Amino acid sequence: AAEYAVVLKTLSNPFWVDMKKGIEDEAKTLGVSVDIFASPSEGDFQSQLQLFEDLSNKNYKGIAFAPLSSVNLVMPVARAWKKGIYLVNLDEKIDMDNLKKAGGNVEAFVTTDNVAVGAKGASFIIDKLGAEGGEVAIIEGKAGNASGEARRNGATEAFKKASQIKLVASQPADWDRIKALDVATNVLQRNPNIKAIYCANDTMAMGVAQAVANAGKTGKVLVVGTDGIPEARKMVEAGQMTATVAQNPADIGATGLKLMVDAEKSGKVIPLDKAPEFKLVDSILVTQ
């Protein structure tokens, strides 16, 4: 096997496509051989565990990964840490209590500050709704995923500080476009006076926009996404989405690879009771 392996969520989402490119570019800068893989879809928890196990069973020196769920890679990651594989968690926080209970750790975790992402999206909505405020909803990612949970907490905490805002719904749409359209339809049905919906990612935000359109409410219901994927940036320019909190997956990926290579130079994996190296990549609100 090459020196390093990378496990991304799914290349069917531009966020992960850009993270692969960032890693590829960084690999050339560092001089390292990297094999980059991804599961076929967001719901492939089991096959991602198998993918991780297959790479962990090869002799890569390090494996950088973004788990599809907080817990689906706890067991294989613990196993890999025990084998002395230098592990870096990209983007989506593996459940660290669960991992410590399974006897492993990760050298580092590189991600966006996801609480700030949800606070930016909510703060923008609050601003746009102005003095009168109104009812708002959050369309979360997969419940329990650290990335979505942080965005949810950041947005919820911001909305709770603004009394003119009424959070009427907070539901998971599992990073899925179809599911988000369905969840937004139901939310719009139950609370037809809703004025804005923060979505924990662009894949979901796009489907939420279609629900809003079906309801004859485009522009009357703000829709804010997260990631800054190409189609969502286009929708934001065209008024189909109000805004998106853009991330820089290329730098998450490059920075994670660099942390992994750096860790390998130490010659031992991180101790179980040492906090992983932590690095945050900025986000930025993208509006019309």
Q: What angle do CA 181, 17, 254 make, to 5 degrees?
A: 130
Contacts of 31 (CB under 8 A, 6+ apart): none
Where on the chain is the footprint of ligand ALL (CB under 6 A)? 9, 13, 15, 91-92, 147, 175, 201, 203, 226-227, 247
Our finding on whether 57 is near Zn ion (CB under 5 A) is: no
Residue 91 vs 264, nearer CB to ligand ALL: 91
227 binds, among Zn ion, ligand ALL, none (CB under 5 to 8 A by kind): ligand ALL
Contacts of 2 (CB under 8 A, 6+ apart): 33, 34, 35, 60
* Closest distance to ligand ALL from the beta carbon of 133 (Å): 27
Residue 1 vs 284, nearer CB to Zn ion: 1
* Closest distance to ligand ALL from the beta carbon of 68 (Å): 8
Contacts of 269 (CB under 8 A, 6+ apart): 81, 84, 85, 86, 87, 105, 107, 263
* Closest distance to ligand ALL from the beta carbon of 58 (Å): 25
201 binds, among ligand ALL, Zn ion, none (CB under 5 to 8 A by kind): ligand ALL
Q: What angle do CA 276, 116, 152 make, to 5 degrees?
A: 95
User: Residue with CB nearest ligand ALL?
Assistant: 147
* Closest distance to ligand ALL from the beta carbon of 227 (Å): 5
Cα separation, 1 vs 194, whole angstroms: 53
Q: What is the dihedral of CA 131, 137, 139, 145, to 10 degrees?
A: 90
91 binds, among Zn ion, ligand ALL, none (CB under 5 to 8 A by kind): ligand ALL
Residue 105 vs 247, nearer CB to ligand ALL: 247
Contacts of 151 (CB under 8 A, 6+ apart): 114, 115, 117, 118, 121, 140, 141, 198, 200, 226
Our finding on whether 1 is near Zn ion (CB under 5 A) is: yes
**183: number of Cβ within 10 Å:** 25
284 binds, among ligand ALL, Zn ion, none (CB under 5 to 8 A by kind): none
Q: CB under 5 A: which stretch of 1-9, 88-96, 102-110, 120-128 binds Zn ion?
A: 1-9
1 binds, among ligand ALL, Zn ion, none (CB under 5 to 8 A by kind): Zn ion
Cα separation, 254 vs 25, whole angstroms: 7
Residue 76 vs 121, nearer CB to ligand ALL: 121
* Closest distance to ligand ALL from the beta carbon of 16 (Å): 7
156 binds, among Zn ion, ligand ALL, none (CB under 5 to 8 A by kind): none
Contacting residues toward Zn ion, per CB under 5 A: 1
